């Protein structure tokens, strides 16, 4: 998967999309939390883009 | 080395339906992808074994161009879609079906007199509609044993045979690579299937054929 | 060579000078790829002189861009020339004709 | 030593990371792009034929 | 004149030839021209730029 | 324009071909009358679509 | 089912090097699916049997030159990466070569053996050129397959090579074109059985009565893979 817009019609911004896809990746790389999603050993990057896929971030998180 | 050429394994069997599947090799050598990926193509879509309805007869036409009331499409159509049904004959070159049935209401290949000697594998196949409240429908259907695709070349109705089982086979090479090199060929072979045969096993039915030429050669 | 030419490569091969292009006509008196070496005939020679004409060839070496510039014999031991003939091929040509 | 490990390795680095291909000039957004890479035994950039 | 040394040889003078294509030997629909260009590695090699 | 092109050619109809004028179940006997090389590409036909 | 099976009734060897086999009666199709399978793996894969090393007695690299010898090194090195020979039961062997006085070098010159036989003994390496002048050149052979570049090869050796050995690219892969073509052939009264020809230009080392066999073999185990599944 690579196509970011079915994340971004849930963050209806696209810009919101790149900070909220960095402070989730950084929880989970820095923050050392790990994905709702189940992961394939993807990056964070994608990881944090596939948690967009389960409906389960915005940046209240 | 000299004569120990790499041999694949089975990647995958990737199996995405009963009907249809992506069976893929790993590694292969530089160009066998295709050596072997078409060989077992030409000898899959065109010269595999099997059974196939090859005439027919409805009650009371000459030729398809009468397009008989009661029925909701025209008898070009229902010539096609009865070449449509796949089906498993034993042990005999030619065989003919009846089919009958009547109300108001589709028409199923389960309708046929079903001899038990030959197999509908697949029974839902609706083969058309009825439009009169007298609507009935009855007729024989020849299925027989032969080989490969056979066009329209050659009361009776004539039909082109669909004898190979094989609804579409395609495959491609792709990059492969060990520790030291990229230069070896993956192969995926797709392939998709009336449901006569499992794919998985016609190649392996089809990979016989190709060996069985090879008998007389193999030392 | 090329095969359809103009027939101008048997003029750019040797004006320019990088083919080895026989002083005086004679006969070949020695030849290794090194060096090619000419018995020049009477008819041409000097009267004092030994009357032989060598070529020593530049072998490999960088051209100012740096491909390579190896000069080569087309001649043969015992082989007559005439003056002004090809002696030794150029880099990018053969018996005298350009051959990019 | 570019030892054989190493590319199992890099073929696990690499194995999603965009990187941005642009031409020069580069008159127009559309001008900068990124890719996924994938490796090549060659030395050219093998590039998408629509793009 | 091109066509007289074609003849000349024992070629084909419409100078195309059908081909097949070895990845199955299928044949190519229509011939197709076939013959001996000239060509010139150019001073722009790769690893020299890479 | 490479694509452009093999799409045109895979398009045209020409009014004599081989396998001219049958009628199919679908694109995928399609496929099997063409590569079997039954009918040409470019051959008039008759299909069921969906 | 009523598949006629083929033997490989025939063979042409019409000169040293180019030969005829043909292999009858075939099915539909199979006249064209072993037609190119066949070719394809005889391009790809028959072994054969290369040059691979060269030591000359008094050079130091390749684009020296001896002193009466027509020809640079280096084109001593194209010439005999063209030169092929059979070797009995070896994966290797070492020739020597020696000549002496003016005129042409060729294969002929070589130190015969019983174990290696050469294909064309008119193949020519150099000319000698002065009344004194020699070579001596240790010429080494490998058995192989496909096509193995010499940059490639030394990267595979991984100890160094001595100062005045000469490397050479190795082409084993013996045949250097194949033709196939179908027909049909008078069997049991009937139509539509193909001929098929397959006919070929090869170095001159092995004949089609093993090649077409061993193709033949390399395909049938290759296939493996696709029955055992």
Same mark, same amino acid.
Not at chain 3, 37 to 42: A, C, G, H, Y
Not at chain 5, 28 to 44: A, C, I, S
């Given at each position: 998967?690579?196509?970011?817009?079915?994340?971004?019609?849930?963050?209806?911004?696209?810009?919101?999309?790149?900070?909220?896809?960095?402070?989730?990746?950084?929880?989970?790389?820095?923050?050392?939390?790990?994905?709702?999603?189940?992961?394939?050993?993807?990056?964070?990057?994608?990881?944090?883009?596939?948690?967009?896929?389960?409906?389960?971030?915005?940046?209240?998180? | 080395?000299?004569?120990?050429?790499?041999?694949?394994?089975?990647?995958?069997?990737?199996?995405?339906?009963?009907?249809?599947?992506?069976?893929?090799?790993?590694?292969?050598?530089?160009?066998?992808?295709?050596?072997?990926?078409?060989?077992?193509?030409?000898?899959?879509?065109?010269?595999?074994?099997?059974?196939?309805?090859?005439?027919?007869?409805?009650?009371?036409?000459?030729?398809?161009?009468?397009?008989?009331?009661?029925?909701?499409?025209?008898?070009?159509?229902?010539?096609?879609?009865?070449?449509?049904?796949?089906? =498993?004959?034993?042990?005999?070159?030619? /065989? !003919?079906?009846?089919?009958?049935?009547?109300? %108001?209401? &589709?028409?199923? #290949?389960?309708?046929?007199?079903?001899?038990?000697?030959?197999?509908?594998?697949?029974?839902?196949?609706?083969?058309?509609?009825?439009?009169?409240?007298?609507?009935?429908?009855?007729?024989?259907?020849?299925?027989?044993?032969?080989?490969?695709?056979?066009?329209?070349?050659?009361?009776?109705?004539?039909?082109?045979?669909?004898?190979?089982?094989?609804?579409?086979?395609?495959?491609?090479?792709?990059?492969?690579?060990?520790?030291? =090199?990229?230069?070896?060929?993956?192969? /995926? !072979?797709?392939?998709?299937?009336?449901?006569? %045969?499992? &794919?998985?096993? #016609?190649?392996?039915?089809?990979?016989?054929?190709?060996?069985?030429?090879?008998?007389?050669?193999?030392? | 060579?090329?095969?359809?030419?103009?027939?101008?490569?048997?003029?750019?091969?040797?004006?320019?000078?990088?083919?080895?292009?026989?002083?005086?006509?004679?006969?070949?008196?020695?030849?290794?790829?090194?060096?090619?070496?000419?018995?020049?005939?009477?008819?041409?020679?000097?009267?004092?002189?030994?009357?032989?004409?060598?070529?020593?060839?530049?072998?490999?070496?960088?051209?100012?861009?740096?491909?390579?510039?190896?000069?080569?014999?087309?001649?043969?031991?015992?082989?007559?020339?005439?003056?002004?003939?090809?002696?030794?091929?150029?880099?990018?040509?053969?018996?005298?004709?350009?051959?990019? | 030593?570019?030892?054989?490990?190493?590319?199992?390795?890099?073929?696990?680095?690499?194995?999603?990371?965009?990187?941005?291909?642009?031409?020069?000039?580069?008159?127009?957004?559309?001008?900068?792009?990124?890719?996924?890479?994938?490796?090549?035994?060659?030395?050219?950039?093998?590039?998408?034929?629509?793009? | 004149?091109?066509?007289?040394?074609?003849?000349?040889?024992?070629?084909?003078?419409?100078?195309?030839?059908?081909?097949?294509?070895?990845?199955?030997?299928?044949?190519?629909?229509?011939?197709?021209?076939?013959?001996?260009?000239?060509?010139?590695?150019?001073?722009?090699?790769?690893?020299?730029?890479? | 324009?490479?694509?452009?092109?093999?799409?045109?050619?895979?398009?045209?109809?020409?009014?004599?071909?081989?396998?001219?004028?049958?009628?199919?179940?679908?694109?995928?006997?399609?496929?099997?009358?063409?590569?079997?090389?039954?009918?040409?590409?470019?051959?008039?036909?008759?299909?069921?679509?969906?």
């Amino acid at each position: 998967r690579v196509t970011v817009q079915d994340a971004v019609e849930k963050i209806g911004n696209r810009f919101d999309l790149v900070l909220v896809a960095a402070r989730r990746a950084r929880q989970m790389q820095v923050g050392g939390k790990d994905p709702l999603v189940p992961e394939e050993n993807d990056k964070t990057t994608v990881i944090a883009l596939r948690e967009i896929e389960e409906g389960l971030i915005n940046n209240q998180i | 080395s000299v004569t120990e050429f790499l041999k694949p394994r089975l990647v995958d069997i990737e199996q995405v339906s009963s009907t249809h599947a992506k069976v893929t090799l790993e590694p292969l050598e530089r160009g066998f992808g295709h050596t072997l990926g078409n060989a077992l193509r030409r000898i899959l879509l065109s010269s595999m074994p099997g059974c196939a309805v090859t005439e027919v007869e409805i009650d009371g036409v000459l030729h398809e161009y009468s397009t008989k009331e009661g029925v909701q499409e025209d008898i070009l159509e229902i010539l096609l879609n009865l070449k449509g049904l796949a089906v =498993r004959v034993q042990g005999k070159d030619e /065989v !003919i079906l009846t089919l009958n049935k009547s109300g %108001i209401g &589709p028409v199923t #290949a389960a309708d046929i007199t079903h001899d038990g000697d030959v197999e509908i594998v697949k029974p839902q196949h609706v083969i058309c509609h009825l439009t009169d409240e007298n609507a009935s429908i009855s007729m024989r259907i020849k299925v027989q044993r032969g080989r490969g695709y056979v066009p329209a070349s050659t009361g009776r109705l004539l039909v082109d045979a669909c004898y190979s089982p094989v609804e579409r086979i395609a495959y491609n090479v792709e990059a492969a690579r060990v520790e030291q =090199r990229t230069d070896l060929d993956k192969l /995926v !072979i797709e392939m998709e299937t009336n449901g006569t %045969i499992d &794919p998985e096993e #016609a190649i392996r039915r089809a990979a016989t054929i190709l060996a069985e030429q090879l008998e007389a050669f193999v030392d | 060579k090329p095969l359809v030419g103009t027939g101008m490569e048997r003029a750019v091969a040797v004006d320019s000078g990088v083919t080895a292009v026989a002083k005086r006509g004679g006969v070949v008196q020695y030849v290794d790829a090194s060096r090619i070496v000419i018995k020049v005939n009477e008819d041409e020679m000097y009267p004092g002189e030994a009357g032989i004409d060598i070529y020593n060839l530049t072998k490999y070496t960088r051209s100012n861009q740096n491909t390579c510039i190896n000069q080569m014999p087309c001649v043969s031991l015992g082989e007559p020339v005439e003056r002004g003939d090809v002696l030794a091929d150029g880099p990018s040509t053969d018996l005298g004709e350009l051959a990019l | 030593r570019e030892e054989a490990v190493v590319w199992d390795i890099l073929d696990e680095v690499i194995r999603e990371h965009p990187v941005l291909l642009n031409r020069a000039p580069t008159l127009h957004r559309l001008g900068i792009q990124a890719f996924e890479p994938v490796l090549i035994e060659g030395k050219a950039i093998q590039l998408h034929p629509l793009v | 004149e091109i066509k007289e040394l074609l003849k000349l040889g024992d070629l084909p003078t419409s100078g195309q030839i059908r081909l097949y294509d070895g990845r199955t030997g299928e044949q190519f629909e229509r011939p197709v021209t076939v013959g001996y260009m000239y060509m010139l590695k150019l001073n722009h090699l790769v690893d020299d730029k890479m | 324009q490479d694509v452009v092109l093999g799409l045109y050619y895979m398009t045209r109809d020409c009014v004599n071909a081989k396998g001219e004028g049958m009628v199919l179940t679908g694109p995928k006997e399609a496929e099997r009358l063409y590569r079997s090389g039954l009918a040409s590409l470019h051959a008039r036909v008759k299909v069921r679509i969906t």
